[PDB]
């Protein structure tokens, strides 16, 4: 396989389905990328750089060897969690680790180097997720700095032969909700040139209507012939609507967070398995799901395990939720390939929101 | 298969290896019976009678259907946890549920009925685990009541046709550490007649030397041609020494409790995987273990998952610990069958206690 090749096999409206070929494997798109701890998984750079540390991961053979996963891994830049969990400047961000108090600076160059030490296959440029709401001035300042940082990320990646020859680099569009800034950002990223283009800054609490409005004008600004990655999104209906707007790749903490907090995704909407109404429900979590949990165990038993505090319960919920997300993406890909995605999206929403 | 048939295939000293045939499957002995949530697993009667309730489990089809496990299940009587988590009399014990305050009485008859509603294959007579230390008078009074309760358990079990024809009933020897009381208890149980005989009252903090001393005289008092079940034991070295003393069956919370609290069992003794010394250790949890965890993942990665608070870490530790216990029992059975158990026990202790 090549280092990176994205091919579009079929289209319906703005939706696309296809493949990304990389040395470590093929990624079917639209793709959902689950947390590593699927054709591709996510590594959490901020977490890994603090425990066990990027140099230690490299000493242990890189992330693929460390976690026993030989297919592609996408790493984020580390910048978002630095703020979530500090001193900012044009150079980067400095911060102290709550784990041991140690000092750490993160810059475009250092982020790319950390991602190199981790050995990931898709590397994210280092940028800022602009807070929401943002004024036009602040959104512009933030986006302009992120574009300067995108060039620095590009140059740092290109300087590391093993990385340049074997990994791929994605740039991130910013600009908050402002069409002109989104356009300026897309133009700057395309001038630098990246293997793929993320839509950043939209997992920030703005609500689905606003997210979709921004996607309506933002995704067409990106190069059509490269993958489009919507970072941090989202619920099943977010994903369907984003695919309708041209997105090819997704990641979100929801399936795992929900799986640890008693929420299971189903074709009839999410359910709170701890609720008493499930104590005698012999149906599987979802009566169409093909996952191993739904082949074997009932809602009543999973309800019991979670209520009893048994770790097995959260594991089964999480396995189901991840598998559900992958089945959603499979149904999306098949429906686009078959020219019936518009009907699928309508049928999906009618059932998911009915909550039957 | 018959309702119950225990056959001894080979012996070495006091140790035996063989099989219990039951309708739902064959149990290879010596056997370790893990918690259900292996040829046979344990159901926790006290927990199940409070959530979801024995009648509810029966409505859902019994425990086998409820938890998706079609091989034999052994249930305890429920009495021990009633005390652990009240008013005692010759009739039984009354107690209030912390879960919802509800009132509950547990007697030999009610315990057998609950175990019937759960649908277990091996039913334990209802008795008291005498506290330790106990004076001779108190140990005798407790044991005498338990023997009266053993007869009531026998009669209640025999009254339920489905249970009498399809399940098995074990009686429990008590008597604390006193040889004469252990003998009286064995005599009373044999006069009533049971399918198997447990040694009760020895998972009570007395220490291994004392436990082994009591087993030395207690196990020979039980019928030789029936299984001998040491309740609540134990660590790997406890198990080996108990097999050397004629025990055929074991259960213990240790593999699961340790698995949730960072302790992994290995042929070189237990390890505390959270310790910093494992942060770069690329070896599996145990370098001979055949379990799926040890085939795939390193100590360093499991250490990382647990330190990160990822549920996956405790799941992997627990899978390994259970599998280790089953590999221990397999090695015990093979060595007895091959006439080299004495050598195995010596080699096991030398390595396990070396802690290399
Ligand atoms: Zn499922
Ligand atoms: Zn193992």
Swiss-Prot record, chains A, B:
Source species, domain of life: Bacteria
Effect of mutating residue 77 to A: Strongly reduces activity
Protein name: Queuine tRNA-ribosyltransferase
Catalytic activity: 7-aminomethyl-7-carbaguanine + guanosine(34) in tRNA = 7-aminomethyl-7-carbaguanosine(34) in tRNA + guanine
Region described as RNA binding: spans on this chain: 232-238, 256-260
Family: Belongs to the queuine tRNA-ribosyltransferase family.
A cellular component term, taken from the record's GO annotations: cytosol
Keyword Transferase annotated: yes
Gene3D superfamilies: Queuine tRNA-ribosyltransferase-like (3.20.20.105)
Enzyme class: transferase
InterPro entries: ArchSynthase1/Queuine_TRR (IPR050076), TGT (IPR004803), TGT-like_sf (IPR036511), tRNA_ribo_trans-like (IPR002616)
Binding site for Zn(2+): 289, 291, 294, 320
Assembly: Homodimer. Within each dimer, one monomer is responsible for RNA recognition and catalysis, while the other monomer binds to the replacement base PreQ1.
GO MF entries: metal ion binding; tRNA-guanosine(34) queuine transglycosylase activity
One BP term from GO: tRNA-guanine transglycosylation
Binding of substrate, residues: 76-80, 127, 174, 201
Pathway as given in its UniProt record: tRNA modification; tRNA-queuosine biosynthesis
Keyword Cell wall biogenesis/degradation: no
HAMAP family xref list: Q_tRNA_Tgt
Record text on cofactor binding: Binds 1 zinc ion per subunit.
